[PDB]
Amino acid sequence: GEPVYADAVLNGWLTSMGLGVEYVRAEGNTVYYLDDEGREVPVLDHACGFGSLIFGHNHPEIIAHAKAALDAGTVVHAQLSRQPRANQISRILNDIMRRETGRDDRYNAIFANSGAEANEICMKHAELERQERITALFAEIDAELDTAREALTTGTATLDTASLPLVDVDGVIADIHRHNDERRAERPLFLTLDGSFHGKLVGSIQLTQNEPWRTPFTALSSPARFLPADEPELIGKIVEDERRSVLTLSLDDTVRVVERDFPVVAAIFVEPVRGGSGMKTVTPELAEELHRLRDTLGCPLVVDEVQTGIGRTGAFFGSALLGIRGDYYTLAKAIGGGIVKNSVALIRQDRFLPAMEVIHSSTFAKDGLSASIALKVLEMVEADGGRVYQRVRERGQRLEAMLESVRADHSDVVSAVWGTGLMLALELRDQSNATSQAIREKAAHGFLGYVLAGFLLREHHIRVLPAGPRSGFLRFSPSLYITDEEIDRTETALRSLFTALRDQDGDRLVL
Amino acid sequence: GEPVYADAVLNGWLTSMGLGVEYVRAEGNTVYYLDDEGREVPVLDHACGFGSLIFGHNHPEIIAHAKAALDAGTVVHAQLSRQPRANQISRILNDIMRRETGRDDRYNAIFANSGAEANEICMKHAELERQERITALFAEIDAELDTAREALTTGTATLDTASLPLVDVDGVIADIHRHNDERRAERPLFLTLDGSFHGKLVGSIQLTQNEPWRTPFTALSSPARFLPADEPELIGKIVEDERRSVLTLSLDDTVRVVERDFPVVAAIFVEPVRGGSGMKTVTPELAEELHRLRDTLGCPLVVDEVQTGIGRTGAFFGSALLGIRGDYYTLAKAIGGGIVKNSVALIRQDRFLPAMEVIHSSTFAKDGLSASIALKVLEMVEADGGRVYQRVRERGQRLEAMLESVRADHSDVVSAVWGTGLMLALELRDQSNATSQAIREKAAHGFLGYVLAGFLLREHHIRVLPAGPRSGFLRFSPSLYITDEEIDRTETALRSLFTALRDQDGDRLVL
Ligand SMILES: Cc1ncc(COP(=O)(O)O)c(/C=N/[C@@H](C)C(=O)O)c1O
Ligand SMILES: Cc1ncc(COP(=O)(O)O)c(/C=N/[C@@H](C)C(=O)O)c1O
């Protein structure tokens, strides 16, 4: 009961899951904690900043580059001056996306500080595009109203009174303007997939499924409809329910009050590999439903590659690998080199509203230091003719094979292997009906994955963090330097874990 | 017409204002650009990352600490493990606020990546406190409805039908539950001051006055009522207009439908020195209106010290200097040492809802690198018995005196000096009726301050950026190492500028 100033509830909970440890140094795929005697104990990191460390902890090339930038007196804070590195970074991502998609499209870049901040840049730019669409529609409706009032007052046409349910000339027009203004000021919707994770700020959290993370904040910001990824014959009907009309007058002899489409949906968000769903890759059938939706509503499709980008899936863009044709793209995690904080929103130049370049800004965005490190990260992942993607793919295959080898012999406690390249997960079978009270209680609290992670830490010196809404998945997203030995030690560790879980050995698994 | 991938509109605009320059190196209060010959031209930086650089660009102590942290293999990405540096940082801020306010209050710290992110942590925690208050109110209304239905059905009391406008027993209760649920799901309000700047993300931008920055995004998120800072006899009426009622039944013989207060305001936000208002310090009368409002509505008062904190005003907290008694505090800018990105929300432990420690999170938040640099920044500003605050105050006084000396002789084009410590500004008199076409056109576009900044750049090698919604203020927020010579050069530069503006020399001022 001494004074505590941060992290008491968080540390209490980590301690009870068996994850109460302090890492004092990190290098490559290894984090070190101190044992009772003050010796460094090495632990294999499969979490790696939730997929921030494609090149591992404190990669010597990234550290040396950072130290060189600082020794050179890089201008970190040069707001409202020419910062050509922003353009140079966007040029490279532009060239990479052209190469990987064969599409000769150009993208404007807006930088931020976090993946949620890049996603929110896209939500704002989306809303700018919806205000454009709205101004134009309302401009046409005024024209239609002028032309219907000219026809009606002169006597060239008569108002059809069978259409009057939908609301005297001047009065019916006022009632239309009142209905339309009501509709105009209603919040927009965003469309996401079930299990979607797009960040936890006031805007982005509404785009994040995890119910305890989101539902307390529901009232603050525009909501998302979470479209059922696996049951996509239903998406069509869910978005059709969300159609909203404005009113105008239609001239033919006869004038009629008629409904016209109002743009409600600001954007569609998608993860090429679904972090909050336990690393499920978007299927071709779903990609094609999202394309239909985007073409149908004429809002942008935002591809969140905060986690899937910068080579993780064995291409630079996972959207490119899985055929998702986005309008806007977002990057963060690995672009900071595992040491700094950087993010980018790529908005197709044919859609990009130039106001955004001067009405949106951030103190720290586009800083000199994270700009230099981004150019280094892009140089490293592009080096030697794209062989780094090849290494991700071959390490990814080796590690997926091990995970499948383990599932095949422990299918009683493992349902699936999910993901691609080095963004993988094991789905754990429900343990809410477990023999051991200790396990069953943890499973019923949504903690099972954390307990099991605890086991792997204390018994095998392997750092794993769960994913998914009830910690029903074990994440494996290590560096492209993961060795065959480290993969064998992980296999050993998982056979041990899934053998104890089979045996319902609650005393060994739960403290 | 070559391909461009970022910043084309932004660079076009900076070029036309005469601010089209690239700074290649920075040290202390100096930024260097390259002249036509490729020689370094030194420029005095009065912008300093909008007040991020209390210790200047690339302070040797901060650079050396950062290089040591990187060479030690700092664990940057240790998510969901014990990170004691978070607690150690919060301990120090806690001790500093106690010392400066004499209040023995304790604060929980939640870290983020940007000032907007810290402000949005506070908006979310505010909304968590409003959901608590709402659950409790609705719990009591159910009880009052049970007790009114028991009284009415048994016959112990009769329903008074003069109260029925506000909506048969069971039917009037359903109509109350329908009204109440409607109200429950409505967006909350935030209260801010006129000219308020709190960030530009989906949540925070609604809290930011600047109309072109905000009005396009109005539909996305809960709004702010911008309270008139100078006319605070009107605030009372503005907040009273925003009162909203729920309905219940009140038992006496007689049952009556009655209105009860619904909690609508999530939070009050304030800057101790108002960045978006041209560096106006909050007056005691306004501080006391904000205290009244907070005590009256029982929502938290959030003190945004993103810009005013870490010694800028001549104390660590500007709230402490000006007697603002906040519930939550936010810090960012200087805490990154001018090289990394870090922010913190301090929430009073008596109000702090422990769910927030586990339902809110961020990939980059609380990273090892910015944590080590924060501890260094806090060591430096606290060093040698608080003499750093003394130096801010004496440098601040010297620079304010020069700005007042300049206003006194150029009161035709300068209306006021605003701010405190090293967070100062000159208010420029309106130039929309200027003789020179060139000046008048720029003033009418809101660009006057940028034009003048251009002059100071090209004619005197001084970097100044404007503040305020029509760039009607010139900001001066340099490092505590600003020399007497640099202050003299700034005086010379401003006499020159304000003499040309007096002379309406549009050919010298506008390119
Ligand atoms: C796909 C995706 N989008 C957005 C964000 C938010 O980025 P941020 O603001 O944290 O820098 C994250 C973070 N994903 C990690 C936290 C995870 O699911 O473990 C992410 O995985
Ligand atoms: C008082 C205040 N609050 C919040 C923010 C947002 O912080 P961020 O997300 O940019 O890191 C800033 C930035 N203020 C600068 C931009 C200014 O007043 O010009 C700020 O000054």
Numbering used by the authors:
A (entry chain B), B (entry chain A): 6 to 172, 178 to 262, 264 to 522
What do the authors of the reporting publication say about this deposited model?
The crystal structures of CrmG in complex with amino donor l-Gln, l-Glu, or l-Ala in P1 space group were determined to resolution 2.35, 2.25, and 2.20 Å, respectively. For these three crystal structures, each asymmetric unit contains two dimers. In the structures of CrmG with l-Glu or l-Ala, clear electron density was observed between the N atoms of those amino donors and the C4′ atom of PLP, indicating that we have captured the external aldimine for these amino acids. In the structure of CrmG with PLP-Ala, due to the shorter side chain and lack of γ-carboxylate or γ-carboxamide group, the l-Ala portion only forms contact with residues of R486 and Q318 from one monomer via salt bridge and hydrogen bond interaction, respectively, without interacting with the second monomer of CrmG dimer. Similarly, in the structure of CrmG in complex with l-Ala (corresponding amino donor for by-product pyruvate), the carboxyl group of l-Ala forms a hydrogen bond with Q318 and a salt bridge with R486. However, CrmG is insensitive to pyruvate inhibition with Ki of 225.9 mM. Based on these three crystal structures, amino donors l-Glu, l-Gln, and l-Ala exhibit strong, moderate, and weak binding to CrmG, respectively, due to side chain differences. These corroborate well with our kinetic data that, Km value for l-Glu, l-Gln, and l-Ala toward CrmG is 80.02, 182.70, and 405.10 μM, respectively. With amino donor l-Ala, 50% conversion of CRM M to CRM N was achieved in 48 h.
